[PDB]
Amino acid sequence: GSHSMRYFHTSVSRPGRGEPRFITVGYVDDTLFVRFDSDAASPREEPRAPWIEQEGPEYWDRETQICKAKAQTDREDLRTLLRYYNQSEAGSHTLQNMYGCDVGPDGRLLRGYHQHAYDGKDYIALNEDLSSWTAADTAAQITQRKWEAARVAEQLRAYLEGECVEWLRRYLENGKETLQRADPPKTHVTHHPISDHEATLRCWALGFYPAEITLTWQRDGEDQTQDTELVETRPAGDRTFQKWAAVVVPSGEEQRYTCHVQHEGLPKPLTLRWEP
């Protein structure tokens, strides 16, 4: 289909309780495939999907080395950030990095990413050109200047256009049973009386993969955006996701309301109504 690969990294300092904890996970689309936690008994990058297990020791050795090296650099960078922001050493701080690539149906690069956040706020991001930077503030500009001096973007571009795309292709093929299978939503509408005067209609979508979905209510064909309660798409724990959308309907109006569902696993968008 269109597809993505992402690596997520978080270091959280904890002054007086040892060294910062480092956790990194890798995803293809919405499927977790690798993990590393510095607080693990014997930290190694570990597989989380059957299709990666076939990779050889050379792969795992290099992944684990990379993980450990980043834990170390993140610790140095956390120290640097205290200086850049004129901060005390007493508090816990957070440093995050996301990078990866999006590819289209033909396997060609659509977009690459490489960006960081400090204490939950944008710090520095590689622009879509894979050649220039956006620094959030005058502290990040210090890093920008160093990274421009060292031609960092050129090195990241090479990865994002190269190994990122090629290895994502490989994973898609090795994991084609699951990664290239869309599970459509199982859908139904439920009715929950609130009072004599009104009831909730809740439109459910269950057991779908990947997570992207659109769930809408209309009344007399008009979208009910402002009156629809829409929950965040949530993991079921069996690889699939769930979502619902609910509206409060006056008694006897239920047939004016229609639930509309779009998912890549569906050949045509669905229309549902409450069926007493």
Partner: peptide, 9 residues
Amino acid sequence: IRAAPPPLF
């Protein structure tokens, strides 16, 4: 597969 890390901040 992962990337080489960038330089320090």
